[PDB]
Each structure stands twice: as structure tokens, then as C-alpha cells.
Design a protein around this ligand. Structure first.
Ligand SMILES: CN(CCS)C(=O)c1ccc(F)cc1
Ligand SMILES: CN(CCS)C(=O)c1ccc(F)cc1
Ligand SMILES: [Cl-]
Ligand SMILES: [Cl-]
Ligand SMILES: [Mg+2]
Ligand SMILES: [Mg+2]
Lengths: 235, 7, 235, 7
């Protein structure tokens, strides 16, 4: 539905939608921009990520509320309330899966294949891992192991590139490590791997802070604090 | 206290 | 699209949607429930109001952000950024108008005409005034005066009923007076009427608090504080 | 400080 709008106008409206906290609109504008077929700049990649992270974040939070109600409904001593809780959880789940499939579809057609610089390629592979991770959070069926492995594989390729091509303080590299560590802890039942990754990432970033300007130091230390927050929660 | 991911 | 779902299931899912902060879903479920053609209970009227107030509240907040950007864009010394800000403000405005028209359509078909008790009739007429007020907030054209008069007329009928049939501490009566006072201040360019209405409403409620239980006292004084907040802001 | 309406 965005095919008739100029790329630049879509980007401008995505920024307006962000200011207005209209994240569904923001995501639709950024999807339209991606579908123009040109590569995205750093700023545009960030707009795409912000938009869909906010959309899927609302869906995930709602899914967790509904899943908890459904879980309580199926305890001993609970009174039968009918199919409605399951049905509504399923509705939200299907919408969430649709958003994840949309993002994964943009990455596959054709953002990843055209991304040659480390900053773009790592960013997109991180995103692929993230949206498979969100699919894994709700998965229960025959493909759940394959969904988890798809997240793992995308994160691993991103990690391999990031370690070769980026400094240990690079914010994309740090955010990738943060999210892969969460994957290990929450999805892959590997809390020790999660802790080891967070600690190694934190320590290697600490040792590289001396190379940075004040502004880059601020950027890197902010994400390092997220790593520390998780280490404090997990240990 | 929910664990942090990259927001 | 809700025609195949049981009324009770729609109400149950509206409550789940509220818990999940999925207010668009909540509103769609409550619209479906209204369209079953039966009158709404007190609780169900509150669910309808909460759902649409949250939906339109997000739209109004976004519209105000966009309208301010557009206003700044049209100042002396501003650089021409093209039609995009106006277009996007118009998109949000049209969506907002659509929600208001939907609510007004439910009230007209056929909630108001079947509402005979003061608590339901005043509630629905207040709602009619509110959604015409939201239309008035964005109106610029030949019908703006008629939109304002439609809000005024609905509020006035609700006020006349509420004064005859409800005690001065009734929360519906208080919330109606609060909103009609805002109408006077913001929409009708009548700040003195707004202040007089808020003060008279507050004082008459104060004098009736002695008749109330602890729980009703809490309900009434909460809305009285909103009246006081406006009086403090306006004087 | 935005004026209050009935929420
Ligand atoms: C401050 N943050 C977000 C928290 S990690 C970033 O700099 C960032 C890093 C990677 C990414 F994919 C998106 C954002
Ligand atoms: C506490 N509040 C909301 C603030 S006025 C109410 O009791 C209420 C009154 C009227 C109405 F139409 C909806 C809600
Ligand atoms: Cl449903
Ligand atoms: Cl638009
Ligand atoms: Mg490099
Ligand atoms: Mg009475």
C-alpha cells in the first residue's frame, strides 16, 4: 500500500510516526521504504528496528499477560471458563507471528543478501536472530527446535562477523551479544553460556573504552550496563 | 526485575 | 466481524484485552457486543467507554504532536519540507474521525433510544457530547459550528437529566460536569462558564458527601479532585 | 499541566 509514496516521504513519515508514538504506522512506512529495493543507511536501519521492536514488544507483552491467565485457568481447582482465553491468546500469538514473519521476509528479500559492510550485515543478522527468538518464545510444535536453531544460526553468523570486523565496544556488537546471551538464558536453556557470554563481552568492552571519544564512551557504557544488569539478575 | 535485551 | 461470537464471549474477551492493554481489540469486542442489540449493563457500559477512550486518546495525542509540527512548519523562516506533515496529520485525523463516527453510530443505533434509566441515558449522552467534542477539536470547515453545537446539545440534555434524577455526588453526574466544563473552556471559548460549572459542581457535591458510605465517598471525591485540578489551572 | 477530563 506504500508503493505510490516516495522513498524519502516514507522515511520522513516514519520519523513523524516515531515522534507521535504511532509505531504500527512507523513500521508500515519503513516496510514500504525497504520494499523500494535500495539499501538502507545506518539511520534508516535504526528506524526499521525501532518501529518493529515497538510493535512486537507490545504483542509480546500482551501474549505474556494472556498466557499467564491461560496457565492459571488450567490449574487444579480452576473453574472452566470456556475456550475464550485460549482463543484470544491464539489471536494475539498469530498476529505476533505475522509481524515476525514480515520482518524475516524483509531481511530475506533482500536486505541481508545486499548487506556487505559489517555494520549492516551484523545488524540484519542480529535482527534475524531476534525475530526467530520471538517466534521461539511462543512455539510449541514440531518446528520449535528448528525455530530455535534458526535464531542460533543467525546470531552465530552475526557474532562471527562482529568479532572479526568490529571493535569490542561497537554498540551493534554489544547489543548483539546482549541479545544472544538472553537467547542462551531464556530460549536455549543454557544459563552458563549466557553468563559467560555477557561477562566476556563486558570485560572485552571495558578494556577497549580507553580508545573512545566521550560520546562513543557514553554509547558503549550504556549497553555495557545492560549486560551488567543481566549478570546481576542471573548470579 | 525483567532481564534486559537491546531496546 | 464479531457477528459469529457469543455476546458473553465478546464481553469476556474485552476484559482480557483490557488486562493486556490491547484497547483496539477491546473496542472491537465491545462494538460487537453492542451490535448484538441488547442493552448494556453498568459494567458493560464502562467497558465500552474505557475501550474507545483509550483508542481515541492515543489518536488525539498523536494528532496534537503532528499538528504542532505542522504549525511550526508554517512559521516565517521555516524551510519547506513538502506535503508530508500535512498528509500524515490528515491520515491520523481521518482515523480519529472514523473512531468518533463509529462510537456516535453505536449511540444512535440504538443505545440512546433504548436507555431509559438515568444512569444509562446520562452516560450515553455524555459519551455523545465527548465524541462530538473530539470531532470539534480537529474541525476546521463549514460544519465546525454544527459539530460544536451537537456536543453542546448532548451535554445539555445529559446535564438536565442528571440534575433532576441523580444526587450531586453521583460519579456519572460529576464526570459529565467535568467534561462539559472542559468543553466550555477549550471548545466553546467560554472560560467563565467552565469555571462557574466546575465550582458549582464541586460545591454541591461537597455538601452531599455526608450522605455517602466510605466507598462512595472515595469514588466521588476522586472526581471532585479533578474538578479542583482544573479550577487551580484556570484561576 | 494539561487540564483534566473524565478518564
Ligand atoms: C543503545 N542501543 C540499544 C540497546 S542494545 C543500541 O545502540 C543498539 C545496538 C544494536 C542494535 F541492533 C540496535 C540498537
Ligand atoms: C472515576 N471516573 C472517571 C473520571 S470522571 C468515573 O467514575 C466515570 C464517570 C463518568 C463516566 F462516564 C465514566 C467514568
Ligand atoms: Cl479471539
Ligand atoms: Cl500519510
Ligand atoms: Mg571494522
Ligand atoms: Mg435517582
Amino acid at each position: 500500500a506504500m508503493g505510490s509514496m516516495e522513498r524519502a516521504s516514507l522515511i520522513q513519515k516514519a520519523k513523524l510516526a516515531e515522534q507521535a508514538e504511532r509505531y504500527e504506522d512507523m513500521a508500515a512506512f519503513m516496510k514500504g521504504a525497504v520494499e523500494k529495493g535500495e539499501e538502507l543507511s545506518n539511520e534508516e536501519r535504526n528506524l526499521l528496528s525501532v518501529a518493529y521492536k515497538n510493535v512486537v514488544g507490545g504483542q509480546r507483552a500482551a501474549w505474556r499477560v494472556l498466557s499467564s491467565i491461560e496457565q492459571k485457568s488450567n490449574e487444579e481447582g480452576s473453574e472452566e471458563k470456556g475456550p475464550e482465553v485460549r482463543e484470544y491468546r491464539e489471536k494475539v500469538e498469530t498476529e505476533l507471528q505475522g509481524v515476525c514473519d514480515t520482518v524475516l521476509g524483509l531481511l530475506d528479500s533482500h536486505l541481508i543478501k545486499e548487506a556487505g559492510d559489517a555494520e549492516s550485515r551484523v545488524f540484519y543478522l542480529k535482527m534475524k536472530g531476534d525475530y526467530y527468538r520471538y517466534l521461539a518464545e511462543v512455539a510449541t510444535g514440531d518446528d520449535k527446535k528448528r525455530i530455535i536453531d534458526s535464531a542460533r544460526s543467525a546470531y552465530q553468523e552475526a557474532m562471527d562477523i562482529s568479532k572479526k570486523e568490529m571493535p569490542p565496544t561497537n554498540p551493534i556488537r554489544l547489543g548483539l551479544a546482549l541479545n544472544f546471551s538472553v537467547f542462551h538464558y531464556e530460549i536455549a536453556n543454557s544459563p552458563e553460556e549466557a553468563i559467560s557470554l555477557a561477562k566476556t563481552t563486558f570485560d572485552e568492552a571495558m578494556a577497549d573504552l580507553h580508545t573512545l571519544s566521550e560520546d562513543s564512551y557514553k554509547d558503549s557504557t550504556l549497553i555495557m550496563q545492560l549486560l551488567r544488569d543481566n549478570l546481576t539478575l542471573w548470579t | 526485575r525483567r532481564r534486559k535485551s537491546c531496546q
